[PDB]
Design a protein around this ligand. Structure first.
Ligand SMILES: CC(C)[C@H](Sc1cc(Cl)c(Cl)cc1Cl)C(=O)O
Ligand SMILES: CC(C)[C@H](Sc1cc(Cl)c(Cl)cc1Cl)C(=O)O
Length: 133
């Protein structure tokens, strides 16, 4: 029951600072424009110890499956090859991605009826809000 409050189907309803976050990450112009237009559905499920997070959008469909605390290799939607670790810290799902000596952190937390996503790359933060679909 570790992630119970995250499980479900969620739809993007707002975004702030995402273009600048993507610039800091190193995403190129065309991908930023098209990805920034995306309105993904995020589908979170749990089966035993395995958490799956799917994202579906007109830009890309992705899927990750993982066990908390256990590193995995990930090709991200913007085509970075990263090493990812996802943990639960005080009820917040914390996703760290490492590649090319760089690091970014994506945190997901339940706040009221929303799932709030905070993405940080150096000093640049973006906040994305999802609601139940
Ligand atoms: C928190 C943000 C870095 C991402 S952005 C994003 C992620 C995926 Cl997996 C797909 Cl298919 C499309 C976009 Cl645009 C988010 O999950 O909202
Ligand atoms: C959301 C995670 C699961 C990663 S992170 C990510 C995704 C996109 Cl599309 C952009 Cl533009 C920037 C970042 Cl940092 C992903 O899969 O893309």
């Amino acid at each position: 029951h570790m992630c119970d409050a995250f499980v479900g189907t969620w739809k993007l309803v707002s975004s702030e600072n995402f273009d600048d976050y993507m610039k800091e990450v190193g995403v190129g112009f065309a991908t930023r424009k098209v990805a920034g237009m995306a309105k993904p559905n995020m589908i979170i499920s749990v089966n035993g110890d395995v958490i799956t997070i799917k994202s579906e959008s007109t830009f890309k469909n992705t899927e990750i499956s993982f066990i908390l605390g256990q590193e995995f290799d990930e090709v991200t939607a913007d085509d970075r090859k990263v090493k990812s670790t996802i943990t639960l810290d005080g009820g917040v799902l914390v996703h760290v991605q490492k590649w090319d000596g760089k690091s970014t952190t994506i945190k997901r937390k339940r706040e009221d009826d929303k799932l709030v996503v905070e993405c940080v790359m150096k000093g640049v933060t973006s906040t994305r809000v999802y609601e139940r679909a």
